[PDB]
Amino acid sequence: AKTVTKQRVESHFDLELRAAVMHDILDMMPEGIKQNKARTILQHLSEAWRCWKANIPWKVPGLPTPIENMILRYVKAKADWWTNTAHYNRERIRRGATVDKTVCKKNLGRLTRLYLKAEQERQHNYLKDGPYITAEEAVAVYTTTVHWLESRRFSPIPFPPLSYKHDTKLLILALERLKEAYSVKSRLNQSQREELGLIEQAYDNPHEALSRIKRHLLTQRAFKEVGIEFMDLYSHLVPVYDVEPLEKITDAYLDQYLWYEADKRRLFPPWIKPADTEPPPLLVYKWCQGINNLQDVWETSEGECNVMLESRFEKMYEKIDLTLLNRLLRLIVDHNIADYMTAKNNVVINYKDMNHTNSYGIIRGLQFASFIVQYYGLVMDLLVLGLHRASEMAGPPQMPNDFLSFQDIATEAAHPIRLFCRYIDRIHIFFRFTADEARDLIQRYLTEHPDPNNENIVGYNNKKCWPRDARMRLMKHDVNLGRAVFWDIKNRLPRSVTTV
Amino acid sequence: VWRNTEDEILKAAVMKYGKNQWSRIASLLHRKSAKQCKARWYEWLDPSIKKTEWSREEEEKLLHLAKLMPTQWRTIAPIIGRTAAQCLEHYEFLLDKAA
Amino acid sequence: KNTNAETRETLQELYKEFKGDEILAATMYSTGKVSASFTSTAMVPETT
């Protein structure tokens, strides 16, 4: 009579689940007089569980209702147990209680299945509840991008020519980037051996390659399927996408090409900032040193207020929309390349045995997805700043500005938004208000979201890492300005595009 | 690529083993792997994939979608019942016949 | 949305010339919809 300890917990749960079933109906709601096929109702029950886990709609065509209700009830019992165990262990792992090495792997597998069930549902809901972005928001976004590009005098990016001069440089860079994955040359596998073979043969004959590439880019719009899996960082997981080596090469090249041309034609204005000119410790220096050089920035004499707000765009890679994104890419590139990119984001995504089809967001594991994310983020910089201030920051197209510079002091001081940097999808804005700008902002804030009960002070979150001598001090005017500024910035962004 | 002999060895293997044991079927094949096996079966050798001519309503629906959801062939295909490579070739083919 | 002439005249011509659709218009024991929609998130949930 041995206890149930830690290694017999799952085995024991199933002994008792399937005992309970056999008690429950297959011998207390029979009237299948013969020999009640309990051995087969149990087989349904185990296949109902496999189908729940794989997200397959399990329906056995003719099967009496009492039996179907019994099976559905017990699969839901097992699913509640399985999911609550996943929650529990993920907290333990996140804070640090287990070092057990089979729990780490069981739990990564459990949360991968749960993520893919949530995701297939979210794609179905797209195709059912329809494009979430209206036909008024989509048109405002499109027209505003056209006005930007036309005032910049952009010059759209053309199809990689036939006798282009740089293509072997661009392809050599592609392939160097790809070999960096297999730097160590481990036991890799069949599939990595085959990818290395492709890289070497296209390293030897660089024109069979470029012929193949430009053929793909010209004719293909239905691609293979990509596999997914997660990288566990103990505090959250990261998706990791696995694309087929042929298309990996065509995308590596397209990546390099688009970035070279975009930067030569000056597509991305200077506030889009993982830029090649400095490392992140240098951006922090330049931001501090840009604030400090604003004009009369530290004076409070007449009652000004500086506000530094910084947030995140909160789901851009996942409510990108492939039709609006196709058209917005077409404003910029050759309709062939726009179509290749947009049709390459719509593939079948596959984990152990679950498959679904991407239709709504973006696969971030493609190689041009840097370009797509930064272009979309440019469009949303425009919705946040407006075309007038964004054109004052980016300066006249014949004479651009540098990171946080303006042309004169009149233009710099002609507006509250003095600095703006957008790391990939992180947003840091710096406002400088006069006394009456601040008073009117707070007026229109309170008018809509009235706080008579002084509860604005409660939600405010500061940094409990400096001493209270150095934290933020929540006076009424201060926390109300903070909230008004946030309320005013979060209103510029439709909720079907991104939010804050 | 693929040759009559291998295609038929595949057919035989699958029809015996079942349609989810890709690794053993791969093992039967010399120089073929389970990715390729699975792809080949689900695009060309599956018998629910039909190689016939297009009904006129199939085609008019085809063009309707390819205008609704441009370049999303994996998403379009199941809504009309051919694989996305078929849908794609036939859409360019209608475009060019009307070219 | 009064953003520009492009948008005003667009919505004018859209609400003017745009009329209802055809193809997708048409194309949008027990049975088993419960069990299906329950072990599959990719369906609309019936509870009966």
Binding site: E47, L127, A135, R327 | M69 | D21
Partner: peptide
């Protein structure tokens, strides 16, 4: 009481979206 042995929607605003964009 005999037991057998175990072994798309599209909205219509997609259209009005796409054509509003072409216009």
């Amino acid at each position: 009481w005999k037991i057998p042995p175990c072994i798309v929607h599209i909205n219509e605003n997609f259209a009005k979206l796409a054509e509003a964009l072409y216009i």
